[model samples]
Target chain A: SHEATVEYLADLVKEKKHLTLFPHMFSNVERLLDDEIGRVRVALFQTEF
Target chain B: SHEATVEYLADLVKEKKHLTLFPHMFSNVERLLDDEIGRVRVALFQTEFPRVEL
Candidate 1:
């Protein structure tokens, strides 16, 4: 699910090494904010960056 | 700017009263994560959900 993927990325953002990838992945990640499911929004918010 | 909006919401989330609207606003807010600007993502992370616990 996208929510789970967002959640996973949220956690991944916590690690410094993965931070570099965030800017790229974020293009996709941000779209989840409008995702129909509230959970995806919540998960995206939970992301560190 | 969208970054400002996200930063504003991040502060708003700190106030207990604004929490209710978070779920609703979140739908819009979440999209800022992918906003082309790095500042927007930075602002979103500063939101205090996990901060509340830490």
Candidate 2:
């Protein structure tokens, strides 16, 4: 599923929370799934929107 | 591993630098990284002053 991409981005943004206070930046991370970013494997997150 | 955190700013800054330079803002792209740019295990002409992956 898309959880990996979302998790990757969330981890990145959370790590940089002190740097970029913009919440939308997390949403703005446009990634091209050259890898299996959108492929379903496991639900790393509790909610998958 | 740690870079998993920094790519966001780097990407945005790189794109912004390119925007400013686009055949014009070429002179002031230095303040962006202060780091450097290089092979990055892929290619060059990139602002990745990077992990000595430079």
Candidate 3:
């Protein structure tokens, strides 16, 4: 799910050791934000960055 | 240039109408984060969002 993906990325972003993954993970975030489902966008914003 | 780009996107993110641009803008952010220059990364963290712990 896009929501789950956003949550996963949000978690990854919180870890300093995982900062390297941000470059790749943000790419996924871009895709998820543009997802066709409105629910996905809502989830993205609700994820607390 | 990457710093400018991040700042630009940061501004865009703050505007509700510009949210759509986020999908495209973040792609650039990903590239900027991996920039060859260390200063770019420094500038990015200096911005908000990831800096604000948001």
* Best by the lDDT measure: 1
lDDT string for model 3 (A1-49, tens) is 2234565455333332333344443443333233323454466677775
Better of 2 and 3 by TM-score: 2
The number of the candidate with the highest TM-score is 2
Candidate 1: which stretches are off by over 4 Å?
A: A1-49, B5-7, B10-54
TM-score of each: 0.17, 0.20, 0.16
- Model 2: clashing residue pairs? A1-A39, A1-A40, B36-B49, B37-B48, B37-B49
Q: What is candidate 2's lDDT per residue for A1-49, written digit by digit as tens? A: 2335565545434333422343343222222111222332234453445
lDDT of each residue in B1-54, candidate 1, tens digit only? 344466444543333233244464333334334343345445556564436432
Steric overlap count per candidate:
2, 5, 0
* Alpha-carbon runs more than 4 Å astray in model 2: A1-4, A21-49, B1-36, B40-54
Instruction: Tell me the TM-score of chain B in each candidate.
Output: 0.24, 0.30, 0.25
Q: Which residue pairs collide, candidate 3?
A: none
Comparing 1 with 3 on TM-score, the higher-scoring candidate is: 1
lDDT of 1 by residue, A1-49 (tens): 3445664454433322322344443333333332334554566567886
